[PDB]
Every structure is written in structure tokens, then in C-alpha cells.
Amino acid sequence: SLALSLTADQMVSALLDAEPPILYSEYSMMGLLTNLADRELVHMINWAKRVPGFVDLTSHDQVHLLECAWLEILMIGLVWRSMEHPGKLLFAPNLLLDRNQGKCVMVEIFDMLLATSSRFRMMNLQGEEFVCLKSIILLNSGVYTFLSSTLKSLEEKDHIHRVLDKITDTLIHLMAKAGLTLQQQHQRLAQLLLILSHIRHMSNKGMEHLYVPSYLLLEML
Amino acid sequence: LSLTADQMVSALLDAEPPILYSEYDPTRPFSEASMMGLLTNLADRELVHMINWAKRVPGFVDLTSHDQVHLLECAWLEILMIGLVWRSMEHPGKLLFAPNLLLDRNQGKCVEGMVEIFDMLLATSSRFRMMNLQGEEFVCLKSIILLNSGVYTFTLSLEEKDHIHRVLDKITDTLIHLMAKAGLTLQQQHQRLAQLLLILSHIRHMSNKGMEHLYSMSYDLLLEMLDAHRLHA
Ligand SMILES: O=S(=O)([C@@H]1C[C@@H]2O[C@H]1C(c1ccc(O)cc1)=C2c1ccc(O)cc1)N(CC(F)(F)F)c1ccc(OCCCN2CCCCC2)cc1
Ligand SMILES: [Cl-]
């Protein structure tokens, strides 16, 4: 696989190059957010195909990872955009919401997204770290619920775990490079991966409130 | 907070709760109601021991009573589930709820929506077996779930969060120490730390799905039990 041969610096360059653009909301809250999310999803599919290791998977496994990860990926993008806007969520440059506007439908999810944004600000999360985390969410979120037990599904799981190890090495490289001690490198890697557990929780609560792209995702692939 | 990695391991190993038995001789085969009854009874007894264990996790009693209950409210089902997965590791294809309650996949079907959670728990047990998860690593992970699960959903609140993040950094140092001691290279140490923490995201998912399936078919209880824990001889 090409992925497993990349250095830390090449993995970061590939992921930075694959970054989708920040979209605007069209010139009702759910309507505006659905329209924005629908446009972001088309870019997310094309971004996913550029994450090293992702296109080495079967179509079926690519769709499963996207089905499991799509809301977590929208949410980490939102939190990243909102970082320099304490108390607000920057859905788009023309759709900056504060807590009060959560009340429209959602306030609980808003509060959890605001807390994540604060955590990233407090940690001084870097763009190189952000693109690594977003790639981890894509590969990790669905890896434990692959249904099959064929030789091919075992090889797919193994491949995903190897790419996840490459992204871990990349995060450690970025931290070493910034001059963190070995202890600081391991502590910061832990703090970043522990935030992924909160993003999973926010995604699940989001869906609970709602009750979505179907296994739609295949055609789009 | 001033402890060594070696002392952190000793404290966590020493604080481990006991393994409980299921209610003896229930009517077998099970119905939906009688399985849910057995599991509710076991979980209710395990909760008393979880509170006692939580009070011995370094840093936990430094929090306010309100913040202790908030962490337990957020973490209790994840903690029951990682204990189940740990007990089940030496029983491929089965979940060891108790030494006298070993279930295979098919029994999950008795309760609607439970077979999906069973399958996810069996996959986690396989992942731990494949990684050769060690007891000293398991007690570290269980402590991380307690301190991490509720920390982001708690005001000069800021001091409590800072304290929890420092204790979490101490448990990370402890995990790395255990891996170093075992003879893993620096690369292997960081990869294994990442693989263990990435499984916590799947345990969170299983916990959320568990609750969703329940409501398809708490703070106050935990506060009384925590309050009452101060009155225990
Ligand atoms: O997620 S489960 O599969 C869940 C996993 C496994 O099996 C179920 C079960 C369990 C746990 C607790 C029980 O009371 C009964 C059963 C397990 C277990 C038991 C002992 C273990 O050592 C390890 C695991 N599940 C059912 C579904 F899948 F069918 F939907 C489910 C059931 C009940 C739930 O909460 C009940 C509210 C109780 N509160 C009330 C407020 C105060 C705090 C307590 C949440 C989810
Ligand atoms: Cl657009």
C-alpha cells in the first residue's frame, strides 16, 4: 500500500491537500443546516477517497466507514471552525450561532460542541493535528462493526489498523517536531484521542434527537 | 497527583471490585422479562461496588459530590461493559455476565435489540484477546473511562476539569510505563496507547446504543448511594 510507505510529513501534506473548502449557508434553522450539511457531504465523500488507505478498501467497507463517521466528521469540522469564536458555533462564515439560537429545535448538542471547541482552544490544537484526528474518526468509527468474517474482511481490518498506526506515528512526529518532550508527546496523544470519545457521544446524541444517508453512500462512491 | 506510575498501578489493582454471581437457579430457558430481571439484579449489586471502587481511584474524592455523581452518571454503563468484556476474554463467542451466567450470541435474541449490543461486546472481547490486554492495562482503561466520560459536560468548574486532566495525564504516564517495562519500543508504546484509547470510542458507542435500546423498550439514585457510602461501616 502506498499509505504505509508515507513519512509523517507526506501523510500531513496529503491530508492538508485533501481538506475540503469552508462552504456558505444559502443566502428556518433545520432547513439552512440540512442544505449546508447536504453540500458538505458531497465534499466529504471526495475527501474520504483522498485519505491514504481509504480507496484500498472495498466499496462496501468504504460506505460502512462513511455511514458510521459522517456526523462525527461534520461535528469536528464545526468545532475546528468555531475555535476562535468563544461562545459561538461557526456553521458557516455567514451562519455564526450563539447558545440562545440553540433553543430553536439542540441546545444540549450546542453546549457539548461549545465545550469541545473550548477544549481545542485550551490545547492550542494545530491544523496538522486536526486533519490527523478527522482521518482517525473516518477509519476508527466503523472498524469494530464490520459484519463479515471472510478472509477479505480480516485483511480490511488489519489494513485499517496499520493506517491508524501510521496516523499515530504522524501525530507523535508533529509533536516531536514542535519540541514536546517524550512525556508531553504521549500525554498530548492521549488527550486528543480521549476527545474522540466525546465526539462519538455528541454524534450518537445528535441521531437520538433526530429520530441521514443510507447504505445513498454507495451510489455516491 | 504526587504518586509514581508504580504506585498508581498498585492503588488501581488494590481497588478492584469483586466478581458477583447472578441470582441462583432462575427458570431456564429465559423470557425477555426474566433475562432483563437477572441482568438488572446483577447490575444493581455491581453498582454498590462500583461506587466503592470509584472512591479509591486517585483524584476522584478530590471532586465535589455533585461532580463525582456526574462522572458516575456518565460512565456507569461503559464501566459495567468493560468489566463484562474483560471477564469474557477467555470465553470466545460467549459473554461471562457472572461465573454462573455465561451467554452465547443466541441468548442475546431473548431481548429485542440486545443481540446487536451482544455482537459489539463479543467484537470488543476479541479485540482485547488479539491485543493480549494485560490486567494492569485494564484497570488503567477503566479509570480513564470514569474520569474522561463526564469531564467535557460539567465558573472558576475550571479547577475541577484541570485536576481531572492532570490525573488522566498521570494514568497515561502509567500505561506508557507498563508498556516500557514490558519491553515495547517507543513506537510500539505510542501505537498500543492509541489502539487502547481508540477502543474507548467503541465502548462509548455500545453504552449509548444500550441506553437507546432501553428507552426503546438516575443522578438521584447515584447521589443517595454516594451519600450512603459515607455512612457505611
Ligand atoms: O445495553 S444493554 O444491552 C446492557 C449491557 C448488558 O446487557 C444489558 C445489561 C444491563 C444493565 C443494567 C440493567 O439494569 C440491566 C441490564 C448489561 C450488563 C449487566 C451487567 C454487567 O456487569 C454488564 C452488562 N441494555 C439492554 C438492551 F440492549 F436490551 F437494550 C441495557 C439495559 C439496561 C440499561 O439501563 C437500565 C437502567 C438502570 N439504571 C437506573 C438509574 C441508576 C443507574 C442504573 C441500559 C442498557
Ligand atoms: Cl457550496
Short mmCIF file of C-alpha atoms and ligand atoms in Angstrom, two decimals:
data_model
loop_
_atom_site.label_atom_id
_atom_site.label_comp_id
_atom_site.label_asym_id
_atom_site.label_seq_id
_atom_site.Cartn_x
_atom_site.Cartn_y
_atom_site.Cartn_z
CA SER A 1 0.00 0.00 0.00
CA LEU A 2 1.20 3.47 -0.73
CA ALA A 3 -0.14 4.67 2.57
CA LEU A 4 2.08 2.54 4.77
CA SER A 5 5.24 3.88 2.94
CA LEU A 6 4.43 7.62 3.58
CA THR A 7 6.57 9.62 6.11
CA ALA A 8 4.80 11.76 8.79
CA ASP A 9 5.42 14.92 6.68
CA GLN A 10 3.96 13.29 3.48
CA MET A 11 0.89 11.99 5.42
CA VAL A 12 0.25 15.58 6.75
CA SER A 13 0.76 17.09 3.20
CA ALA A 14 -1.70 14.58 1.64
CA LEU A 15 -4.33 15.33 4.37
CA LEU A 16 -3.83 19.17 4.22
CA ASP A 17 -4.14 18.96 0.36
CA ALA A 18 -7.39 16.90 0.66
CA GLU A 19 -9.06 19.45 3.05
CA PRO A 20 -12.50 20.50 1.73
CA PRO A 21 -13.32 24.21 1.45
CA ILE A 22 -15.45 26.15 4.01
CA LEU A 23 -18.94 26.46 2.39
CA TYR A 24 -21.52 29.27 2.99
CA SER A 25 -25.10 28.76 4.03
CA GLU A 26 -27.62 29.65 1.34
CA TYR A 27 -28.17 33.42 1.04
CA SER A 28 -35.64 28.24 9.36
CA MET A 29 -32.75 26.60 11.16
CA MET A 30 -33.12 22.95 10.24
CA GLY A 31 -33.59 23.90 6.58
CA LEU A 32 -30.40 26.05 6.50
CA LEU A 33 -28.39 23.34 8.38
CA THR A 34 -29.76 20.47 6.18
CA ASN A 35 -28.85 22.45 2.98
CA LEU A 36 -25.29 23.16 4.31
CA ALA A 37 -24.76 19.54 5.54
CA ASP A 38 -26.03 18.13 2.17
CA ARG A 39 -23.42 20.25 0.30
CA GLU A 40 -20.65 19.35 2.84
CA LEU A 41 -21.41 15.58 2.42
CA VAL A 42 -20.58 15.70 -1.35
CA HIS A 43 -17.15 17.20 -0.43
CA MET A 44 -16.68 14.65 2.46
CA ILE A 45 -17.08 11.66 0.03
CA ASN A 46 -14.40 13.15 -2.28
CA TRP A 47 -12.18 13.99 0.76
CA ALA A 48 -12.53 10.36 2.11
CA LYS A 49 -11.28 8.94 -1.27
CA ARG A 50 -8.05 11.04 -0.74
CA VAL A 51 -7.34 9.78 2.86
CA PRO A 52 -4.35 7.41 2.39
CA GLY A 53 -5.50 3.74 2.70
CA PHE A 54 -9.26 4.53 2.26
CA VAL A 55 -9.55 3.59 -1.50
CA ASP A 56 -7.57 0.32 -0.80
CA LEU A 57 -10.83 -0.90 0.92
CA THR A 58 -13.83 -2.50 -0.90
CA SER A 59 -16.76 -0.20 -1.88
CA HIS A 60 -18.86 -1.96 0.82
CA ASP A 61 -16.27 -1.17 3.59
CA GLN A 62 -15.81 2.46 2.37
CA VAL A 63 -19.63 3.00 2.67
CA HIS A 64 -19.74 1.36 6.16
CA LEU A 65 -16.98 3.73 7.49
CA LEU A 66 -18.78 6.80 5.97
CA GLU A 67 -22.19 5.67 7.36
CA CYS A 68 -20.64 5.38 10.83
CA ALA A 69 -18.46 8.54 10.71
CA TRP A 70 -20.35 11.25 8.70
CA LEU A 71 -21.96 13.20 11.64
CA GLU A 72 -18.75 12.97 13.80
CA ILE A 73 -16.77 14.40 10.79
CA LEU A 74 -19.29 17.29 10.24
CA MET A 75 -19.07 17.99 14.01
CA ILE A 76 -15.24 18.04 14.30
CA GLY A 77 -15.15 20.43 11.27
CA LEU A 78 -17.71 22.71 13.02
CA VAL A 79 -15.71 22.66 16.29
CA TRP A 80 -12.46 23.46 14.37
CA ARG A 81 -14.14 26.44 12.53
CA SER A 82 -15.56 27.70 15.88
CA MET A 83 -12.28 27.66 17.79
CA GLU A 84 -11.54 31.34 17.63
CA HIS A 85 -15.14 32.31 18.42
CA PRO A 86 -15.68 31.60 22.13
CA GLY A 87 -19.38 31.01 22.98
CA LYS A 88 -20.34 30.63 19.26
CA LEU A 89 -20.62 27.88 16.58
CA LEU A 90 -19.44 28.96 13.08
CA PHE A 91 -21.63 26.66 10.89
CA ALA A 92 -20.51 28.94 8.00
CA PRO A 93 -18.89 32.42 7.76
CA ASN A 94 -22.50 33.75 7.30
CA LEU A 95 -24.07 31.45 9.99
CA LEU A 96 -22.40 32.09 13.40
CA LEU A 97 -24.79 30.93 16.21
CA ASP A 98 -24.57 31.51 19.94
CA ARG A 99 -26.23 29.36 22.60
CA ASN A 100 -29.55 31.22 22.53
CA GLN A 101 -30.23 30.19 18.99
CA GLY A 102 -29.88 26.55 20.01
CA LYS A 103 -33.27 26.72 21.65
CA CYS A 104 -34.94 26.76 18.23
CA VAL A 105 -35.16 22.99 17.94
CA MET A 106 -30.46 21.05 20.01
CA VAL A 107 -29.25 23.30 22.95
CA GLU A 108 -27.74 20.18 24.68
CA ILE A 109 -25.74 19.35 21.47
CA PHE A 110 -24.73 23.07 21.13
CA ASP A 111 -23.35 23.08 24.71
CA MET A 112 -21.35 19.84 24.04
CA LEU A 113 -19.96 21.32 20.73
CA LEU A 114 -19.03 24.62 22.58
CA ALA A 115 -17.19 22.52 25.29
CA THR A 116 -15.23 20.67 22.54
CA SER A 117 -14.27 23.98 20.85
CA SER A 118 -13.02 25.31 24.30
CA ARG A 119 -11.02 22.10 24.85
CA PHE A 120 -9.30 22.52 21.40
CA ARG A 121 -8.61 26.26 22.15
CA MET A 122 -7.18 25.38 25.66
CA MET A 123 -4.93 22.69 23.97
CA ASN A 124 -3.85 25.05 21.09
CA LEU A 125 -4.92 22.29 18.60
CA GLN A 126 -2.93 22.77 15.32
CA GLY A 127 -4.37 22.31 11.78
CA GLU A 128 -1.86 19.44 11.14
CA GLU A 129 -3.27 17.68 14.28
CA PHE A 130 -6.91 18.40 13.24
CA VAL A 131 -6.60 16.70 9.80
CA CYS A 132 -4.98 13.64 11.55
CA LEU A 133 -7.91 13.43 14.04
CA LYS A 134 -10.55 13.75 11.25
CA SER A 135 -8.84 10.83 9.34
CA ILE A 136 -8.79 8.73 12.60
CA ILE A 137 -12.58 9.28 13.02
CA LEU A 138 -13.20 8.11 9.41
CA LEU A 139 -11.10 4.89 9.82
CA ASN A 140 -11.87 4.13 13.51
CA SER A 141 -15.64 4.80 13.97
CA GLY A 142 -16.89 1.82 11.86
CA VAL A 143 -13.91 -0.60 12.05
CA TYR A 144 -15.37 -2.62 15.06
CA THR A 145 -18.81 -3.23 13.34
CA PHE A 146 -17.72 -4.83 10.05
CA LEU A 147 -20.23 -7.71 9.80
CA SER A 148 -18.36 -10.20 7.71
CA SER A 149 -15.95 -12.84 8.89
CA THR A 150 -14.35 -13.63 5.48
CA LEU A 151 -10.54 -13.65 4.84
CA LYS A 152 -11.06 -10.31 2.96
CA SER A 153 -12.82 -8.62 5.99
CA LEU A 154 -9.90 -9.75 8.29
CA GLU A 155 -7.37 -8.25 5.75
CA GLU A 156 -9.51 -4.99 5.62
CA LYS A 157 -9.49 -4.64 9.47
CA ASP A 158 -5.70 -5.34 9.52
CA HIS A 159 -5.14 -2.63 6.81
CA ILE A 160 -7.25 -0.03 8.74
CA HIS A 161 -5.32 -0.77 11.99
CA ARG A 162 -1.97 -0.34 10.11
CA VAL A 163 -3.13 3.06 8.62
CA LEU A 164 -4.31 4.13 12.14
CA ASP A 165 -0.78 3.20 13.46
CA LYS A 166 0.74 5.37 10.63
CA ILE A 167 -1.53 8.34 11.71
CA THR A 168 -0.44 7.81 15.40
CA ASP A 169 3.25 7.91 14.27
CA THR A 170 2.37 11.13 12.29
CA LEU A 171 0.81 12.83 15.38
CA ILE A 172 3.89 11.88 17.51
CA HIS A 173 6.23 13.20 14.73
CA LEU A 174 4.33 16.58 14.60
CA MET A 175 4.64 16.87 18.43
CA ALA A 176 8.34 15.92 18.50
CA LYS A 177 8.93 18.43 15.75
CA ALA A 178 7.23 21.18 17.77
CA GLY A 179 9.71 20.37 20.55
CA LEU A 180 7.50 18.40 23.02
CA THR A 181 9.37 16.02 25.42
CA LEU A 182 8.61 12.25 25.12
CA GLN A 183 6.25 12.51 28.16
CA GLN A 184 4.44 15.58 26.63
CA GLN A 185 4.10 13.69 23.28
CA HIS A 186 2.35 10.65 24.92
CA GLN A 187 0.13 12.88 27.18
CA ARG A 188 -0.96 15.09 24.22
CA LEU A 189 -1.65 11.99 22.01
CA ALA A 190 -3.87 10.62 24.88
CA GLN A 191 -5.73 13.95 25.37
CA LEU A 192 -6.50 14.18 21.60
CA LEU A 193 -7.76 10.55 21.32
CA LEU A 194 -9.87 10.88 24.53
CA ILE A 195 -11.75 13.84 22.88
CA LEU A 196 -12.80 11.38 20.07
CA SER A 197 -14.90 9.53 22.74
CA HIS A 198 -16.80 12.84 23.39
CA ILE A 199 -17.28 13.38 19.59
CA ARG A 200 -18.75 9.81 19.33
CA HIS A 201 -21.14 10.69 22.23
CA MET A 202 -22.23 14.01 20.60
CA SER A 203 -22.83 12.15 17.25
CA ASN A 204 -24.96 9.42 18.96
CA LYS A 205 -26.99 12.09 20.91
CA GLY A 206 -27.48 14.03 17.63
CA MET A 207 -29.00 10.93 15.93
CA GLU A 208 -31.14 10.12 19.04
CA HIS A 209 -32.64 13.59 18.86
CA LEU A 210 -33.19 13.32 15.16
CA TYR A 211 -35.06 10.06 15.19
CA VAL A 212 -29.44 10.60 7.31
CA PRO A 213 -27.61 8.95 4.38
CA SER A 214 -28.39 5.28 3.77
CA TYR A 215 -26.02 2.49 2.89
CA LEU A 216 -27.10 6.60 -0.95
CA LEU A 217 -23.41 6.44 0.17
CA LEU A 218 -22.63 3.51 -2.21
CA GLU A 219 -24.07 5.29 -5.25
CA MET A 220 -22.17 8.45 -4.27
CA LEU A 221 -18.97 6.40 -4.06
CA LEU B 1 -1.22 13.51 41.90
CA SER B 2 2.17 13.07 43.54
CA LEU B 3 2.15 9.29 43.02
CA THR B 4 4.62 7.28 40.86
CA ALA B 5 3.43 5.08 37.98
CA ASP B 6 4.19 2.06 40.07
CA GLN B 7 2.05 3.29 42.95
CA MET B 8 -0.81 4.29 40.62
CA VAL B 9 -0.90 0.64 39.30
CA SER B 10 -0.86 -0.75 42.93
CA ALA B 11 -3.69 1.61 44.04
CA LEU B 12 -5.86 0.61 40.99
CA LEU B 13 -5.16 -3.18 41.34
CA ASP B 14 -5.93 -2.95 45.13
CA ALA B 15 -9.22 -1.01 44.45
CA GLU B 16 -10.62 -3.68 42.03
CA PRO B 17 -14.22 -4.63 42.95
CA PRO B 18 -15.21 -8.32 43.42
CA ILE B 19 -16.80 -10.59 40.75
CA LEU B 20 -20.50 -11.11 41.75
CA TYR B 21 -22.81 -14.08 40.96
CA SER B 22 -26.18 -13.90 39.15
CA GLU B 23 -29.36 -14.76 41.19
CA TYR B 24 -29.09 -18.57 41.74
CA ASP B 25 -31.25 -21.02 39.69
CA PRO B 26 -33.56 -18.91 37.70
CA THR B 27 -36.04 -20.54 35.39
CA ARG B 28 -34.18 -21.57 32.31
CA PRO B 29 -34.94 -21.05 29.39
CA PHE B 30 -35.30 -17.36 29.63
CA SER B 31 -38.01 -14.99 28.60
CA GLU B 32 -37.40 -11.28 27.79
CA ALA B 33 -38.66 -10.22 31.28
CA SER B 34 -36.68 -12.89 33.27
CA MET B 35 -33.35 -12.22 31.42
CA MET B 36 -33.82 -8.42 31.92
CA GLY B 37 -34.67 -9.22 35.61
CA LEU B 38 -31.48 -11.30 36.14
CA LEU B 39 -29.30 -8.61 34.42
CA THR B 40 -30.98 -5.69 36.34
CA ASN B 41 -30.43 -7.54 39.69
CA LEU B 42 -26.71 -8.22 38.86
CA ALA B 43 -26.10 -4.62 37.60
CA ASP B 44 -27.85 -3.14 40.72
CA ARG B 45 -25.49 -5.14 43.02
CA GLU B 46 -22.39 -4.28 40.88
CA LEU B 47 -23.26 -0.54 41.18
CA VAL B 48 -22.72 -0.53 45.01
CA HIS B 49 -19.20 -1.98 44.47
CA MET B 50 -18.50 0.46 41.56
CA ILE B 51 -19.15 3.46 43.91
CA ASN B 52 -16.66 1.94 46.45
CA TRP B 53 -14.12 1.37 43.65
CA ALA B 54 -14.62 4.95 42.26
CA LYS B 55 -13.85 6.47 45.74
CA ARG B 56 -10.42 4.68 45.58
CA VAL B 57 -9.49 5.95 42.04
CA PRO B 58 -6.79 8.58 42.78
CA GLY B 59 -8.22 12.13 42.31
CA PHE B 60 -11.91 11.04 42.38
CA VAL B 61 -12.68 12.04 46.06
CA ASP B 62 -10.90 15.44 45.46
CA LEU B 63 -14.01 16.41 43.36
CA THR B 64 -17.30 17.80 44.78
CA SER B 65 -20.10 15.25 45.50
CA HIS B 66 -22.05 16.74 42.51
CA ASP B 67 -19.04 16.17 40.12
CA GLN B 68 -18.44 12.60 41.50
CA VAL B 69 -22.10 11.73 40.72
CA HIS B 70 -21.86 13.40 37.22
CA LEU B 71 -18.81 11.20 36.30
CA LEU B 72 -20.61 8.05 37.58
CA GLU B 73 -23.88 9.00 35.77
CA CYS B 74 -21.94 9.36 32.51
CA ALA B 75 -19.65 6.33 32.94
CA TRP B 76 -21.61 3.56 34.79
CA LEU B 77 -22.77 1.51 31.72
CA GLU B 78 -19.33 1.82 29.99
CA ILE B 79 -17.67 0.55 33.26
CA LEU B 80 -20.12 -2.42 33.56
CA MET B 81 -19.46 -3.20 29.85
CA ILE B 82 -15.62 -3.07 30.00
CA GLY B 83 -15.77 -5.37 33.11
CA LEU B 84 -18.01 -7.80 31.13
CA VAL B 85 -15.62 -7.69 28.11
CA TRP B 86 -12.58 -8.31 30.43
CA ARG B 87 -14.36 -11.32 32.14
CA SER B 88 -15.33 -12.72 28.69
CA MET B 89 -11.81 -12.63 27.10
CA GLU B 90 -11.02 -16.32 27.90
CA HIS B 91 -14.52 -17.42 26.55
CA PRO B 92 -14.53 -16.78 22.75
CA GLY B 93 -18.12 -16.43 21.38
CA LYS B 94 -19.59 -16.02 24.94
CA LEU B 95 -20.28 -13.20 27.47
CA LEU B 96 -19.46 -14.09 31.12
CA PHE B 97 -22.03 -11.81 32.93
CA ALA B 98 -21.15 -13.88 36.06
CA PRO B 99 -19.37 -17.22 36.74
CA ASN B 100 -22.93 -18.76 36.79
CA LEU B 101 -24.27 -16.69 33.79
CA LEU B 102 -22.26 -17.39 30.59
CA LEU B 103 -24.34 -16.45 27.48
CA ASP B 104 -23.65 -17.14 23.74
CA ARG B 105 -24.99 -14.92 20.96
CA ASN B 106 -28.27 -16.68 20.57
CA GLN B 107 -29.36 -15.96 24.08
CA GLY B 108 -28.98 -12.22 23.26
CA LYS B 109 -32.09 -12.62 20.97
CA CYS B 110 -34.35 -13.17 24.03
CA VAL B 111 -34.39 -9.44 24.43
CA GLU B 112 -35.14 -7.25 21.46
CA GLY B 113 -32.28 -5.10 20.33
CA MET B 114 -29.90 -6.83 22.75
CA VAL B 115 -28.30 -9.15 20.04
CA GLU B 116 -26.74 -6.04 18.32
CA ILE B 117 -25.09 -4.99 21.67
CA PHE B 118 -24.01 -8.66 22.28
CA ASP B 119 -22.26 -8.75 18.86
CA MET B 120 -20.45 -5.41 19.59
CA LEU B 121 -19.38 -6.70 23.10
CA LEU B 122 -18.10 -10.04 21.54
CA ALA B 123 -16.08 -7.98 18.93
CA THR B 124 -14.50 -5.91 21.79
CA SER B 125 -13.58 -9.09 23.74
CA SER B 126 -11.90 -10.49 20.51
CA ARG B 127 -10.02 -7.18 20.02
CA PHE B 128 -8.68 -7.36 23.65
CA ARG B 129 -7.74 -11.08 23.19
CA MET B 130 -5.95 -10.29 19.84
CA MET B 131 -4.03 -7.41 21.60
CA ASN B 132 -3.22 -9.59 24.71
CA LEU B 133 -4.67 -6.85 27.00
CA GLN B 134 -2.99 -7.15 30.48
CA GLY B 135 -4.77 -6.73 33.88
CA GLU B 136 -2.60 -3.65 34.73
CA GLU B 137 -3.68 -2.05 31.38
CA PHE B 138 -7.37 -2.96 32.01
CA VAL B 139 -7.50 -1.17 35.45
CA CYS B 140 -5.90 1.93 33.80
CA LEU B 141 -8.53 1.91 30.98
CA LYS B 142 -11.44 1.50 33.46
CA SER B 143 -10.15 4.52 35.50
CA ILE B 144 -9.80 6.60 32.24
CA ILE B 145 -13.50 5.83 31.38
CA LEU B 146 -14.60 7.03 34.88
CA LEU B 147 -12.62 10.32 34.71
CA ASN B 148 -12.96 11.02 30.94
CA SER B 149 -16.63 10.18 30.09
CA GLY B 150 -18.21 13.11 32.02
CA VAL B 151 -15.33 15.66 32.16
CA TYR B 152 -16.48 17.63 28.98
CA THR B 153 -20.17 18.03 30.21
CA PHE B 154 -19.63 19.68 33.67
CA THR B 155 -17.19 29.05 36.75
CA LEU B 156 -13.78 29.05 38.39
CA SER B 157 -15.59 24.09 37.25
CA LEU B 158 -12.32 25.08 35.54
CA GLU B 159 -10.17 23.94 38.57
CA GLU B 160 -12.10 20.56 38.71
CA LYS B 161 -11.56 19.93 34.91
CA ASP B 162 -7.83 20.89 35.23
CA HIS B 163 -7.42 18.42 38.16
CA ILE B 164 -9.13 15.57 36.19
CA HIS B 165 -6.94 16.29 33.08
CA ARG B 166 -3.78 16.11 35.31
CA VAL B 167 -4.94 12.72 36.82
CA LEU B 168 -5.69 11.47 33.23
CA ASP B 169 -2.09 12.52 32.25
CA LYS B 170 -0.78 10.52 35.27
CA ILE B 171 -2.76 7.39 34.08
CA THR B 172 -1.31 7.91 30.50
CA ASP B 173 2.24 8.04 32.03
CA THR B 174 1.32 4.81 33.95
CA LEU B 175 0.14 2.98 30.75
CA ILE B 176 3.39 4.02 28.93
CA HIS B 177 5.48 2.88 31.99
CA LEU B 178 3.77 -0.59 31.96
CA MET B 179 4.46 -0.90 28.16
CA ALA B 180 8.09 0.27 28.52
CA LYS B 181 8.72 -2.16 31.38
CA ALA B 182 7.23 -4.97 29.25
CA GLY B 183 9.92 -4.15 26.67
CA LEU B 184 7.91 -2.38 23.90
CA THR B 185 9.93 0.04 21.66
CA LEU B 186 8.90 3.76 21.81
CA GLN B 187 6.97 3.32 18.50
CA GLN B 188 5.14 0.19 19.85
CA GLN B 189 4.31 2.08 23.11
CA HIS B 190 2.61 5.02 21.27
CA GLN B 191 0.80 2.69 18.78
CA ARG B 192 -0.51 0.44 21.60
CA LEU B 193 -1.61 3.50 23.71
CA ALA B 194 -3.54 4.79 20.61
CA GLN B 195 -5.17 1.38 19.89
CA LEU B 196 -6.33 1.09 23.56
CA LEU B 197 -7.79 4.67 23.67
CA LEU B 198 -9.50 4.22 20.20
CA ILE B 199 -11.37 1.15 21.65
CA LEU B 200 -12.82 3.54 24.35
CA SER B 201 -14.71 5.32 21.48
CA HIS B 202 -16.36 1.93 20.61
CA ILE B 203 -17.22 1.35 24.34
CA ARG B 204 -18.87 4.84 24.42
CA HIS B 205 -20.87 3.84 21.24
CA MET B 206 -22.01 0.50 22.79
CA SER B 207 -23.06 2.40 26.03
CA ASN B 208 -25.11 4.99 24.01
CA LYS B 209 -26.75 2.19 21.90
CA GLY B 210 -27.53 0.27 25.14
CA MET B 211 -29.41 3.30 26.60
CA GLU B 212 -31.21 3.97 23.25
CA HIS B 213 -32.43 0.30 23.11
CA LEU B 214 -33.52 0.57 26.82
CA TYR B 215 -35.66 3.65 26.16
CA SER B 216 -36.96 1.98 23.09
CA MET B 217 -38.37 -0.61 25.44
CA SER B 218 -30.50 8.07 37.74
CA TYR B 219 -28.39 11.02 39.08
CA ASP B 220 -30.60 10.87 42.26
CA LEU B 221 -30.05 7.07 42.82
CA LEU B 222 -26.22 7.53 42.44
CA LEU B 223 -26.15 10.61 44.77
CA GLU B 224 -28.05 8.70 47.56
CA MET B 225 -25.69 5.67 47.07
CA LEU B 226 -22.63 8.07 47.19
CA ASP B 227 -24.12 9.95 50.22
CA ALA B 228 -24.83 6.49 51.82
CA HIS B 229 -21.26 5.40 51.08
CA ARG B 230 -20.13 7.90 53.62
CA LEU B 231 -22.36 6.21 56.22
CA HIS B 232 -21.10 2.63 55.51
CA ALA B 233 -19.10 0.92 58.35
O1 LIG C 1 -27.04 -2.11 26.85
S1 LIG C 1 -27.58 -3.41 27.24
O2 LIG C 1 -27.68 -4.49 26.24
C1 LIG C 1 -26.84 -3.92 28.76
C2 LIG C 1 -25.43 -4.50 28.58
C3 LIG C 1 -25.63 -5.81 29.33
O3 LIG C 1 -26.92 -6.17 28.86
C4 LIG C 1 -27.59 -5.08 29.45
C5 LIG C 1 -27.15 -5.10 30.91
C6 LIG C 1 -27.92 -4.49 31.86
C7 LIG C 1 -27.51 -3.46 32.63
C8 LIG C 1 -28.30 -2.88 33.55
C9 LIG C 1 -29.56 -3.31 33.76
O4 LIG C 1 -30.37 -2.74 34.68
C10 LIG C 1 -30.00 -4.35 33.02
C11 LIG C 1 -29.19 -4.90 32.10
C12 LIG C 1 -25.83 -5.49 30.84
C13 LIG C 1 -24.84 -5.70 31.78
C14 LIG C 1 -25.12 -6.04 33.07
C15 LIG C 1 -24.16 -6.28 33.99
C16 LIG C 1 -22.85 -6.18 33.69
O5 LIG C 1 -21.90 -6.41 34.63
C17 LIG C 1 -22.54 -5.85 32.41
C18 LIG C 1 -23.51 -5.64 31.50
N1 LIG C 1 -29.21 -2.95 27.64
C19 LIG C 1 -30.47 -3.65 27.12
C20 LIG C 1 -30.81 -3.77 25.67
F1 LIG C 1 -29.80 -3.99 24.87
F2 LIG C 1 -31.61 -4.79 25.50
F3 LIG C 1 -31.47 -2.72 25.27
C21 LIG C 1 -29.41 -2.07 28.60
C22 LIG C 1 -30.17 -2.42 29.70
C23 LIG C 1 -30.43 -1.61 30.75
C24 LIG C 1 -29.94 -0.34 30.82
O6 LIG C 1 -30.10 0.58 31.85
C25 LIG C 1 -31.08 0.18 32.83
C26 LIG C 1 -31.33 1.37 33.80
C27 LIG C 1 -30.62 1.24 35.18
N2 LIG C 1 -30.14 2.47 35.82
C28 LIG C 1 -31.19 3.20 36.52
C29 LIG C 1 -30.65 4.52 37.11
C30 LIG C 1 -29.43 4.30 38.02
C31 LIG C 1 -28.35 3.59 37.21
C32 LIG C 1 -28.94 2.29 36.64
C33 LIG C 1 -29.18 0.01 29.76
C34 LIG C 1 -28.93 -0.81 28.71
CL CL C 2 -21.35 25.12 -1.94
#
